[PDB]
Amino acid sequence: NTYAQLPAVSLKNIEGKTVQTNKLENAGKPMIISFFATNCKPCLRELKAIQEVYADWQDETGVRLIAVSIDEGQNAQKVKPLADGNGWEYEVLLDSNGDFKRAMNVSLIPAVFIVDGNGKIVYNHTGYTEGGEAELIKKVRELVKEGHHHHHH
Q: Where is the Thioredoxin domain (predicted)?
């Protein structure tokens, strides 16, 4: 099991398939969910920074990024073209209900939810706004240290 400890909400992925967040699993690797609007660039401070060093992070913890649209499906139709145009190397989710943002509470974007390798929510940082990136990598390191080699101590 490696979900994201998400509420029972039905969302739409890039494939146009109805995926429930409660059952949302990557592949046994930790996940970072970035909550962002349907038209933002500098607001995606974490997403941009992580994107640049994304391979390094995958190299280590193998963490992936989940780009989720805090909008409705009709408006979120612009999220995926953003992903393609900008050059995002991760999964993108479109909220087709608009309740997912409410369920996780998006006080201020960007909102960061980090999921541990055990598929549980380990870190939350909503609306850090600049400088928060430091905390992103820091928690990543926490996961690395917890991942002991061939042992748990």
A: 1-145
The angle, 0 to 180 degrees and rounded to 10, between the axes of the packed helices 45-52 and 133-146 is 50
Amino acid identity of residue 16, one-letter, is G
The two tokens of residue 129 are 């706004």
Q: What angle do CA 150, 151, 153 make, to 5 degrees?
A: 150
The structural domain count of the chain equals 1
Helices (H), the chain: 45-52, 54-60, 79-86, 100-104, 133-146
Domain with 132 in it: what CATH number? 3.40.30.10
* Structural domain boundaries enclosing 59: 1-153
Residues linked to residue 12 through DSSP beta bridges, in sequence order:
18, 94
* Collapsed DSSP state (helix, strand, coil) of residue 20: strand
The secondary element (H helix, E strand) that includes residue 87 is none
The approach used to solve this structure was NMR
Q: What are phi and psi of 51, to 5 degrees?
A: -55, -40
Q: 67 with 47: CB under 8 angstroms?
A: yes
